[PDB]
Amino acid sequence: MAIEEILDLEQLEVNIYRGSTFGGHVAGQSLVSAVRTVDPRYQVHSLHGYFLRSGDAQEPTVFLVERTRDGGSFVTRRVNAVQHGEVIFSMGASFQTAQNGISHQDAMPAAPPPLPGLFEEWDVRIVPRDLLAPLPGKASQQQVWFRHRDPLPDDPVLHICALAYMSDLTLLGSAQVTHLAEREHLQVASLDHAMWFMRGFRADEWLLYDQSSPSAGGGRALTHGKIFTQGGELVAAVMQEGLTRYPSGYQP
Amino acid sequence: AIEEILDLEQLEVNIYRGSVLQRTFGGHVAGQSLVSAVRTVDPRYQVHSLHGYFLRSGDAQEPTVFLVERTRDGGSFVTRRVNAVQHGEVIFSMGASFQTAQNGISHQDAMPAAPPPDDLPGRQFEEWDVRIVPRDLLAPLPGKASQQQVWFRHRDPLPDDPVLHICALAYMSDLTLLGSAQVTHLAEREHLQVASLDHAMWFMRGFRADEWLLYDQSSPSAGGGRALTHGKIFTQGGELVAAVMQEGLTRYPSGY
Ligand code: NA
Ligand code: NA
Ligand code: NA
């Protein structure tokens, strides 16, 4: 419903696009920018970016694409998302031809099926704390089931660009599971994003976002996610650092 | 040798030059790309993350020039982008974030059960002590395809420059993590095309690279000619000090 239009950019020129703020939204449209400059024989397999500034949600965003390399097997792009002459998000992305190699996969974690409910167009559901299967020595775990209510066209771009989008949705939350108490004294915001796209999925079908936050300190927390189809496939991996900061005066 | 990563000639504001196995050259170049970033940053801000892409092989008999971009300079965070260049080509491209000392929620995962290094046996690793946890002693996690644990330590004491330590750790990870992808594929290795595609790192707490670090590694997935790997680095006292993710080429030739 909404997500298609969010990711439908206007081309202003070669390597110049416009989308008409949720971090995932800037992220997703930056990725679409990149993709629309790459031969579709090459499909995206990773992205890295820094959230530099807060978006103005009431204004368009211009995307300036750089064609970093174009080789035989991999193509690489950088995107700067701009508003009011300032870069709000700066991204890299890599793309590869269909090729062959070694195969393996971590098994899907223990999770209940989809459950309570955490973006009207998405069906999002959190695992309640007493239904969570602990794993050894891990301080802070969160499982989230999501999926698009309405079916979506089969375009892999859309599905990947949509997954980029939803991936910024609950992940940083996982860092505050054991800190419910200091949740009115935290400055919170995404600092970065890194994603690896490994396998196909129906984004209109159930996805498990298994999340963890292995560390917090110095006013930051790191989070880590794994995305799975109900049948046990690893679709993507995500890492995200975020601001989790006490004000200048405040001590716990 | 590791201290030579820090040796950069400055050619002009935001332009630096580093002087004259492929994984080794890549790790050098990446490290020097970061050091270049660090020289343009107010030292009140200390590095905490970096992401980069290994674009091209380069020539280890030519010098490299580093082109720094001062992407953002705010009150708490500074951001840099760097392009390492040889003969007009970007060979490596990178970003890093720098923050002042501030405060926030605290937690970390427990150090996994590993055996101490001292009762383990273990030309480019000459400066280092490296001890690979045997498959039979490794504490496995549920559902994991491919884990590996390595202890490492710089043999000789190092200067007290935290940047040198960060580079030391980032260097050894660039030499050792992608190996974790091959743990269960030992019959297939000789046929593979192998390369580093990227790396992403997060530097959380202070440590020392001339003291024991445990690298707890895994390869959660491989396919399509690629392999993803991941790790966390602890001190011997159990402090989690860095996290890394890295993807590599692990490709079958068209024939095999
Ligand atoms: Na190639
Ligand atoms: Na500095
Ligand atoms: Na700032």
Side-chain angles (χ1 to χ4, degrees), chain B residues 1-2 5 20 22-32 54 57 59-60 91 124-128 167 170-176 194-196 199 246:
Chain B
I2 201 60
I5 291 215
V20 159
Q22 166 64 254
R23 210 177 258 164
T24 288
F25 188 59
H28 193 80
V29 171
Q32 285 205 297
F54 295 93
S57 42
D59 193 345
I91 72 177
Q124 83 268 17
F125 292 105
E126 195 200 339
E127 288 177 79
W128 304 89
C167 287
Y171 181 74
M172 286 284 291
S173 167
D174 283 343
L175 301 192
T176 66
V194 157
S196 293
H199 68 193
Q246 176 162 42

Side-chain angles (χ1 to χ4, degrees), chain A residues 8-57 59-107:
Chain A
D8 175 335
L9 309 175
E10 173 181 17
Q11 180 171 16
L12 296 176
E13 247 284 326
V14 169
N15 309 316
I16 301 191
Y17 296 85
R18 176 155 71 181
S20 44
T21 318
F22 174 45
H25 181 285
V26 197
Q29 290 181 323
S30 309
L31 186 56
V32 164
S33 289
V35 171
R36 287 185 64 175
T37 66
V38 185
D39 182 331
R41 216 169 46 225
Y42 298 79
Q43 291 282 302
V44 63
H45 70 81
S46 71
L47 65 78
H48 318 132
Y50 287 109
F51 297 103
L52 306 159
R53 263 161 276 248
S54 61
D56 185 353
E59 282 293 83
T61 307
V62 176
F63 302 86
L64 309 175
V65 180
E66 173 192 296
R67 300 195 186 195
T68 309
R69 67 146 159 203
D70 291 70
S73 315
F74 299 79
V75 175
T76 312
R77 300 292 189 256
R78 302 196 282 163
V79 174
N80 275 359
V82 185
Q83 300 191 285
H84 314 291
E86 311 260 58
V87 183
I88 63 168
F89 181 71
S90 172
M91 195 199 79
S94 188
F95 303 73
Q96 189 203 9
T97 46
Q99 296 177 322
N100 214 344
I102 51 157
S103 276
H104 60 247
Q105 202 202 268
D106 286 353

Side-chain angles (χ1 to χ4, degrees), chain A residues 158-179 181 184-201 203 206-218:
Chain A
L158 180 59
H159 287 239
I160 262 160
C161 291
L163 193 54
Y165 182 89
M166 284 296 288
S167 76
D168 182 52
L169 193 34
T170 71
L171 216 216
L172 208 71
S174 72
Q176 288 164 88
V177 165
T178 74
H179 308 288
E184 299 293 332
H185 313 73
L186 277 180
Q187 287 174 87
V188 180
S190 299
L191 292 167
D192 75 16
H193 214 60
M195 273 188 79
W196 295 265
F197 310 97
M198 278 144 278
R199 287 177 194 82
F201 52 109
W206 282 111
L207 292 160
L208 171 62
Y209 205 177
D210 180 59
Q211 323 170 339
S212 174
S213 176
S215 175

Side-chain angles (χ1 to χ4, degrees), chain A residues 44-53 66 68-69 73-74 76-80 87 90-94 96-108 135-140 174-176 178-179 186 191-194 196-199 212-222 224 226 234 237-241 243-248 250, chain B residues 47-56 69 71-72 76-77 79-83 90 93-97 99-111 140-146 180-182 184-185 192 197-205 218-228 230 232 240 243-247 249-253:
Chain A
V44 63
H45 70 81
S46 71
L47 65 78
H48 318 132
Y50 287 109
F51 297 103
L52 306 159
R53 263 161 276 248
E66 173 192 296
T68 309
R69 67 146 159 203
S73 315
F74 299 79
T76 312
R77 300 292 189 256
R78 302 196 282 163
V79 174
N80 275 359
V87 183
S90 172
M91 195 199 79
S94 188
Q96 189 203 9
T97 46
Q99 296 177 322
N100 214 344
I102 51 157
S103 276
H104 60 247
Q105 202 202 268
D106 286 353
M108 197 178 187
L135 303 170
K138 292 192 176 58
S140 198
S174 72
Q176 288 164 88
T178 74
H179 308 288
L186 277 180
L191 292 167
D192 75 16
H193 214 60
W196 295 265
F197 310 97
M198 278 144 278
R199 287 177 194 82
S212 174
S213 176
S215 175
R220 308 183 312 287
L222 190 59
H224 182 183
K226 291 143 150 283
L234 190 53
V238 191
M239 285 282 251
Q240 179 163 59
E241 195 173 37
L243 189 77
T244 67
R245 190 165 63 194
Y246 299 149
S248 303
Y250 184 95
Chain B
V47 69
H48 68 83
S49 70
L50 62 72
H51 308 76
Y53 270 135
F54 295 93
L55 299 183
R56 266 163 273 248
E69 176 191 287
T71 304
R72 185 265 317 265
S76 290
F77 288 85
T79 309
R80 296 296 184 255
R81 290 191 307 174
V82 179
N83 281 348
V90 179
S93 191
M94 184 205 141
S97 195
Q99 182 195 23
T100 52
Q102 316 191 301
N103 311 106
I105 54 178
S106 255
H107 60 261
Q108 78 190 263
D109 288 350
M111 198 185 176
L141 299 172
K144 297 230 161 198
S146 200
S180 68
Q182 308 304 322
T184 70
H185 295 304
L192 279 179
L197 302 175
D198 78 18
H199 68 193
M201 302 179 187
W202 297 267
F203 308 108
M204 285 113 41
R205 290 162 188 95
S218 104
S219 184
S221 190
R226 306 192 310 292
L228 191 60
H230 171 75
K232 322 209 174 73
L240 170 60
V244 178
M245 284 267 256
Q246 176 162 42
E247 187 171 49
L249 189 70
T250 54
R251 185 170 65 197
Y252 294 155

